């Protein structure tokens, strides 16, 4: 290998290394002819015109380092429900990144009682105790006889009986830290210099939070990370876990046969998260401990407040703590109604009735449901134990601090504007009313009212979908076959003394939350000029997402999530596009729906990013 | 404190002494000179030092962007035709762009169920509509072997042959990278720059980064994962089995091995399911892609001038792939059922159908599906609507004049795509396709099965670069049944006491085995190895791993090489290339393991190679 | 206007332009067209396509076999680096061990009985039983050996166990890592650095790569067949779309599916998972020197050939490769049976009502069947990029850098047994930046802990809690033609539970609750519980270049700005990190539970041209 450096047009327009030799024969030249001890040229004069791949060069940095600090708030012993105000002390000469601790203490529903047992299904031979209730339907044509029967069981089987003890589970809402903070604001001179709610939160964690950043953010928020379990081999090469006599079969004419398995060619296991966190259901709930972060734009290390910049006497982090009841909820303990059918095939005397004779056919088919226990309640008495604001304070020499503050003059900063508008129409053309700065994106969504209601059992995950969320049962069954002769003198192939038996039980039930987009199209117009053409959802959830932002714009899962961008470059610092205040005036943002109306009302959310300054 | 000079290293890092001696130096002459205010300012700091804390920003000469989009000249599109789109004249620069592809709602042609398969054993044959019945008797051991072949719906009720059924349809697993066959940029009826699906699959394999993953799969019709949850798997201090075999101890005191005892968390089990476009449905609902295109101008820095290239004479081509490569045909609710069943009798003509007392029964049952005969795919599936998406960018008259006169020439990127197919298992490529300088290729060599119309599996293999093979994972419902008929003799150890076990396929999986085809590459250009012989992980991993940072993704393909000549590949500023001489005379030597003629196979070879274009 | 002028300062940049057009024409420029540089002093042009030309460079790698001869496990491995570039960058290790198989071995002896009464063992099976003649309960126990497919195994016949390679085998088989210069360590890292850099330092556009390179096996997707198959369903007729009789939908009766969908599970078959063979392991191990960026490649005139070479001590084989269960399994099997007439509860009881079976499989290692301590290392060679410039850069690059920063580990583990102590860190004596934690058990590396190959990069006490798929099955018969079968004893109960699979969840335990930072006098950082260690930071903290860690116990003590960049943002002086304490709180390590606190330190030194 060697280096070739001047080969045609492409090698001079790349690295132009004839015109670097000539910068270098002529500045020898003149550092000689100008009286220098070393006629070699320094790295920067190279560096006018050439960049050097191999370079160890840094700038020393004005002395700094930085310390965290915690503080209690002012407004006594924190609760659910409340507002809970931070003085921010006098500490660092700036002040940057902060993180809230909320500890929640370990909590468990109270003791309530098993329910009622569900009505009769068939019409005839209804038994009803306190421990299942029984009904059948007779079918005298086909002689079958099929019998209903349900009944309250624990996990492992065993029956319960009605009115006696139960006790349900309790179980966080999704990303909980988040739900938490209703609104977050930091206060100066009793104005909010910047606020947001936990709309703005939610949009964070759909488009913000990539994957290297993703394990950290949900045990931050208090959200359950899926854990990886490893079962036995599934596959082992060369053998196979069904029984021979199906294993490797031929058809009379040598060709093998379809439905026949065959040995493995590998030897594999396989892997399945589980979860056992805030948001599983549990007997007791323990302690839980989140470290929810404030998302103000002084967050950057370079955007830090100067302290004394901003008073003492009145900057405030003042939050907005939501109900416990949109918090914790309760959801079916160690208690399953047990549904189950079976039907009595018989050709005799009585057939399809309880009388009948000669028993052919058994089938039996048994689902297992989670049961709420009644009188089962969260604790309203939870305590919230302990809630700290950490503050990130930095500190720089006194020199560099004298010059910083006399000759910045002002900060660029990015605020919060929130709008939420009811609506019940399938189209509507919605005045942006709140916005009043640059604005350099738009957080969109179209929420149905319904992922928030108290009647919504799914309430604790739908909250912050931007859909409508229904759940798809997908069912595990085990199947079973039994045959047996009960007469040992008659041979059973082709006999009724040969019985049959079958049973299909649920093994176990997902639920899939299908999501049913909430948004069609979406138009953006100011003093009726379009910024955004009638474009399809899927151009701002996806589209815009993906091309725009790099590794500071994630494509959202949620996929009610739209990104309206105004700018080339939404995570950066540096301003790269907004839409001009007169215009941030008369603002409209036009939806088409094809699921929002009278029965379905949705709230439209719209939280733009907006361009301020603030002066020292 | 902040303590800002511990000797040696505080200096060289921090130089705090030279800073305040800066500080001091420039207050005394700005003081001397004559300035009212002998501050230094934040410049003069930093031309030694760098701030930390600094909000200093450039303000941007003002631009702004809107998308417009446009319909093609060529028509109504359809499959296997060109489609052409002017670039329209709006603004002064035209960027990223995307295409709107809209596929109509499909579903399959009414087919037939098809013939039952042939005998299995040789006694005992009975073939009728519903099912195919043959036989092995055994008279030694007393086992009659009795096979059974029938078609069930997923309820299990058996299908008439000949009678009425429909296949499923689904998209190939990328249809909006498979369905631009080819894509070009044509100034002037020649091409200026253009790539084919093999780049777009290149493309999928090392540029889309996870936290841009998700929208990337839906802007190309690629079905995304969704996550579900099961009831409680683990609930503490309890235990699913039934109690005679929890918690035992043997004789000895000992704890069983194999006994289970109660779980110690409470857990559910997450699972992923998928329902989009590539999953089998009776009907495969409109699919609405935005496939981005990949050329080098998507980089706003990077805005081609609308006054350099004329509207007019500039053109977007692309050629639509034919729908047989894209909608495929699967199997619908229609199974076969094969059931194998073992009848050990004792008595009088064992292993016969006509044995008498029959002792133990085997059931075994696999399920396969079954494609419908004559069901295919609606050719008359329209194209209901394509278009072009183009980003105009808008600058002021001032700077448009200013930048068009200066700037001269821009860097762009171009593919240069050959393929090569092979039956040897080593050879030497020559790269015809460079001209100009090369900054990586992307390299692989894909079976020639993985995209031929008889490869069932095609749907899925046509991006792999590997050989794929389908092995499958049984999950098998193992039942026991024990009787005894007699209620006057003790069951233990009568063989009045009955046997009875079945083996039911509760699902199936298929693990897509990766064999590579590459076990070494040597890179060889004029005579000068520029990488020795190295085996393929080499290439596709390492290579990924150390360089590109999140420009570069550690491809999942087993498959796909990286080919690196640049230091820091997806940067606009270059970063080292092979010149054109050596371009000019380029060889691709590999060995591989697979490659025969048996096993033909592709030697897929895209280069990014730079090029220049000028203004105006 | 106002906010626009702030932002764009349009009306300024106009004024510019037609100032500079003024000036040009009177100079006596034949163009009065300002020049983009002109601009740039002001404003920024976000459509730009400069860019400056690089000082001609190339770049190739150079593949080098030991200096030591023959590779062994448990072995000191030296390469030279060869006169090849005027720099060299970044450098990996292929390794390469043989397919390899474990001893043939016999099946074990069968289980002690379980129950005091009808014992009897064969050479397949052990049985015993539980009377019970009050409840008419006749309890029995079996216990044998089979195979996957079930056929019964025979007690000391033939078997052998299967072989498994540890979790990130390529981390822990380079014991020691070593740049030596002029016969001294210039930088150096053990294993525990290098898992460090797995939990923090490799994002997911780069972990499948990391994975494979340092020979972790990776999930495999797999489809299933449709579980949902819209407007049909699974279940049997007779319970689907049940009403009540007051014509509401019944509570647990399945309806027809809404969606066609169907399941995704991930498989491995890679070194970590159990095979009869495992097939010869390729690794390529990234040595993680500060000197992989290609700006700080170290130039070769500076540190010649000769006294430079990269020093690797090599893992014992018996903590990397290890037996597992292979085709052989304990079924446990329990059958109750429940009789009414006479002899009822014993194995001579009549008139059987009521039948169950519960079946459980252990997999079971075979005796006398270990891993072969003839496997070679049949290669390792160090693979080292090299850089070549023009002689012109190359000279004045040599007489004008003066120096580089650099990126160096110190390293300290102290064995623990108290439940809160404080720690003085010995082995800091530069700058910091940043420091890795972990308390990690001294049993997630015993020879005794048979998850040894797990648990070993963990830092915190993993536990196993089994998970069970249970297949549920039911059975009736009736046994008289001549009588009906609702309310009789001749209708016949049969059920089983068989287990279908078992996974195991490896539930961590933390071994720290908070961590206080001294150093000479000075709280660096204040008594915090582990989790802002662990979350908040690496959240915050790094961008790109600092992942949030899966291990519960991997901790990140900060003391930069930007992390992992190479501008200098930050440390901990020398005189404070001369005198440095890090104290922590367990509620786990005491003297029944010793743990090591493992700290890493990444400090800043400089390196002389």
New interface residues.
Partial sequence: ?????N??K??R?????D???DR?KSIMCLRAKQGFS?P????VD?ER??????????????????????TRPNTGNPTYNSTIQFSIPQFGD?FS?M?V?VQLAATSASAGTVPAL????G?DDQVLTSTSVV?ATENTTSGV????T?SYV????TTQTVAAAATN?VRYCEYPGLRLFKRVKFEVNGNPLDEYTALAAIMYNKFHV????????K??IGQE??????????????????????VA?????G?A?????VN?????????????GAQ????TQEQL?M?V?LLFWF?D????IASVSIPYGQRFITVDIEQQSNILFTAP??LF???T????LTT?A?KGT??????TQ?????????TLASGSSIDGTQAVQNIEL?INN????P??H???I???G???IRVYREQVQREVNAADQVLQSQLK??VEFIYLGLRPANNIAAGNTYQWRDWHHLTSV?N???????????????????????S????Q?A???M????????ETETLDTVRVKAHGI????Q??A??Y???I???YG??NL????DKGALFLN?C?YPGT??????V??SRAREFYIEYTSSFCDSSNPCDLISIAKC?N?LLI
């Fill in positions: 290998f060697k280096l070739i450096a080969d045609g492409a090698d327009m790349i690295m132009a290394n015109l670097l030799n270098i070393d070699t040229p320094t790295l190279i015109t050439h960049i050097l791949l191999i370079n160890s060069h840094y700038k020393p940095f004005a002395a700094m380092g930085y310390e965290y600090q915690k700036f990144d993180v601790h569900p009505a009769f299904i019409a009904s006889y099929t019998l209903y349900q624990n996990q492992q089987g589970f990539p994957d290297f950043k993703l394990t950290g953010w045990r931050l990370v899926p854990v990886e379990a490893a079962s036995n081999l599934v596959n082992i090469a060369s053998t196979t876990p069904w029984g021979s006599p199906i079969l031929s058809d009379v004419n060709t046969v379809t439905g026949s398995p493995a060619a590998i030897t594999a296991r396989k892997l399945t998260q589980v979860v056992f599983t259901p549990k007997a401990n470290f972060p967050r290390p370079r955007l830090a303990g160690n109604l047990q549904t059918v079976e039907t009595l005799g009585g309880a009388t009948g004779v000669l028993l058994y089938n039996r088919y048994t689902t297992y449901t989670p950490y930095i500190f720089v020499t020199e560099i004298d010059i910083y006399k000759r910045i002002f900060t660029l700065w640059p229904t798809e049962p997908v069912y595990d069954v085990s199947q079973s076959y039994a045959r047996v002769s009960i007469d040992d003198t008659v041979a059973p192939v082709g009724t003394t040969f019985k038996s049973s299909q039980v093994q176990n039930q997902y639920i899939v939350p299908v379009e910024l955004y053409a474009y399809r899927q151009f959830r996806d589209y997402p993906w091309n790099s590794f994630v494509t959202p899962q105004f080339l610092y540096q301003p790269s596009g907004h001009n205040i361009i300054f």
